[PDB]
Symmetry: none
Amino acid sequence: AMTRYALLVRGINVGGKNKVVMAELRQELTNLGLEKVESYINSGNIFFTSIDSKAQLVEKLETFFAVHYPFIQSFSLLSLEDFEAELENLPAWWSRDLARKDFLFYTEGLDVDQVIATVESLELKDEVLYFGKLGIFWGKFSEESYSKTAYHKYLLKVPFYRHITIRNAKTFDKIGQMLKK
Amino acid sequence: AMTRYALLVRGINVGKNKVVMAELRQELTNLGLEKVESYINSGNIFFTSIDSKAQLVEKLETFFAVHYPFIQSFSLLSLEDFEAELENLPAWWSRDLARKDFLFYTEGLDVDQVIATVESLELKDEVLYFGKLGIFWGKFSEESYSKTAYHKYLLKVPFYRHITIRNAKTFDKIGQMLKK
Amino acid sequence: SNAMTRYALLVRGINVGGKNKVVMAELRQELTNLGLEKVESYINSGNIFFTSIDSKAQLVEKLETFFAVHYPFIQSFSLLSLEDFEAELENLPAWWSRDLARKDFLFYTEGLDVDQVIATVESLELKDEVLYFGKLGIFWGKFSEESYSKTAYHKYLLKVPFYRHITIRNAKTFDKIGQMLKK
Amino acid sequence: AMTRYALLVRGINVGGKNKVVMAELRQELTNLGLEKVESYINSGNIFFTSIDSKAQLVEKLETFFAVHYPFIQSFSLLSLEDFEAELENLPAWWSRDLARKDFLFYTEGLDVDQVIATVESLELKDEVLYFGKLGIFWGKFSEESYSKTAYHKYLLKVPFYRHITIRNAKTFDKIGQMLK
Ligand SMILES: [Cl-]
Ligand SMILES: [Cl-]
Ligand SMILES: [Cl-]
Ligand SMILES: [Cl-]
Ligand SMILES: [Mg+2]
Ligand SMILES: [Mg+2]
């Protein structure tokens, strides 16, 4: 059955490199046979519909990126049904006005249980996190204490850093909206 | 364009101020720098980037302030910068002086004030030349070394923690790593 | 022989450390040309599923000959049927479903002297861990990340002669293998 | 191409600790994917063949030792081709009947410029040394004068001591033959 997906990528359109023009990428994916292709902002949030199996889509996209955008070396790919399931188990604090709220989306092929063990080893300070099914909800309470959080101090040190796609809560919401189309 | 840089830091891996090179190289890779390499353990890092130098300096300052807060100055220079310096080496820089050091300037340094401070020192059995990236400073003899301004006065200057000192062999190694 | 049987073919050591490269789409096509049917793969670590009515002995010989020519770094493999796997599911340790820090299944490979593997494993001094010898391999649970580096699993498995002749999968992948076989 | 390497370590199998059982280590390295793994004596002379890049092999071995033999903090890793290049430039005195002939092999990551400056600072007596590509050839001529040599009196003082891997000339020769 036709399924809608969100395809999220990291590390693009920053530092004057890894350039991806959204209009071009939407056209490319349309030309590969993905339907109703849309995007949001410029960090790599792509939505499309397909009847192909998830495994087929992952192989297609891996092949496409390896040839045409080889700096895209990880991506998250999740369905409307996956996201709806996540929306049924949101932390109560996720809706509150914390200073910063980020969602760390897992990517295809990620060793999630190892990520969880690594995150669990960090000593958390003025922050709260919850392991969801598509990624990690991670809230930091205050701009006063932000620089002392494990999020701020240690994320660049973790082995999984380039293999997660990080978005703020505003974009997390928008991803859900765009999946419902 | 894609530019190769040397990032040099003072005061690490001595006494404390611990930095594991393999960790730093991976952290800088995560920060977005490419083809990150290091030489020995005193803080000689090489990377490629097409980002503007001003954005590189800001990213690195922010990075060190969180991850290695004892790194409170650094030198950042390009291959092109180094090659320009190599075209105006003092003739004495190639001779067997007892000691030869290069004092690399750091980002944000008030170079004109450094030059005024250094010119105020009474030199003895030594010669120095103000280059574009820093100061070439040769001391002729071990016998006379303890009477040199380099020995007697460098710890007395305000700019000491804001220069990165390397010996001549390491200065050459930095150029070779930039050219790789 | 006599019935169309669904098999899992598991290999170790591929697509890691910048070598031992196997492209899944290529392998699926090549095994289809070899005469295996409905060939599917899970992820990239070497988990292949196929259907065949050929005898297991002939399947093993054909696969050995195939790898020797096409992927000579594949020097052992596990080959098991849906029936085999369902039999293993009837005999899971009670702790295998619990929230241990790490759970792995060490799948035996074709031609392996299982009795030697058992004797070697039994010679190891276990610490914060538990293992059970199943039909298709060894269930091996490690209770905690804080004690993991003191386990025999961690300290000694690179020392054993059988290491390159078992195919290690985590419990989540063990489950996925069963799901892929049952399709 | 398949390349043969020698992997040399120091400080093992002495002083009642730092135990490495050669048969175990050979098996471990085989299990990591290294081929035709062999060893000589018990001081840490291992030989293996691989298609992996030198950089890949260094990282593989560093990671392995840090987890499984953390007292192996340095190592020498050199190819047949490296050794053959060294064999084209042997000192003429290396075949002569000196009382003692040793080779100080450099290790991965060693600050070789530092080592060279430190060694050059020593006052040599009845001995001769030559700086090769892979390390230092160091001959002591006579049993009667051995106790006055810098090799005997000063080597233990150097900061680099635990970061080089010392072999006698017999073992140096054997390393070459095991490389093929
Ligand atoms: Cl965002
Ligand atoms: Cl000043
Ligand atoms: Cl004087
Ligand atoms: Cl020896
Ligand atoms: Mg847990
Ligand atoms: Mg001769």
